[PDB]
């Protein structure tokens, strides 16, 4: 962890286009739009509402470091993703077919690209059958 705690702060204040210790939530709506997102101001104010645990909106990483210091791979956020398959499960066992996973992948929430969702179920359907099991996916999401 000693080799990443220095150069990350170069990207932390990179959105403000200056040297100030600011996460720049007002300028994040221009930085992400320059990247090609262009969100609304309601979702933009919702970003640092839970990302920045301080509460101001622009920070010298109390929680911008803690956002990096949350690996999202241990057993505290591995069952919450495993519950997201359970909302789609019918008749138990994690039955989810490639057709049903493509049906739910390109339709709801924040949709993926077709070049992403076409190959997303590829490593989770190595047997080629009609059941993309959740345990074969969270094992791929174990390093996420």
């Amino acid at each position: 962890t000693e080799e990443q705690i220095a150069e990350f702060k170069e990207a932390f204040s990179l959105f403000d286009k200056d040297g100030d210790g600011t996460i720049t939530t007002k300028e994040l709506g221009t930085v992400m739009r320059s990247l090609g997102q262009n969100p609304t101001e309601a979702e933009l104010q919702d970003m640092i509402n839970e990302v920045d645990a301080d509460g101001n909106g622009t920070i010298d990483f109390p929680e911008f470091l803690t956002m990096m210091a949350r690996k999202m791979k241990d057993t505290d956020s591995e069952e919450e993703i495993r519950e997201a398959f359970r909302v789609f499960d019918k008749d138990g066992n994690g039955y989810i077919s490639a057709a049903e996973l493509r049906h739910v992948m390109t339709n709801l929430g924040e949709k993926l690209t077709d070049e992403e969702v076409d190959e997303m179920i590829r490593e989770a359907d190595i047997d080629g059958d009609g059941q993309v099991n959740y345990e074969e996916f969270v094992q791929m999401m174990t390093a996420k």
Partner: peptide
């Protein structure tokens, strides 16, 4: 519940 159980998996694949 369903679009918020979609917005997590579709974003976790993006994070991987």
């Amino acid at each position: 519940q369903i679009p918020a159980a979609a917005s997590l998996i579709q974003t976790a694949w993006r994070c991987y």
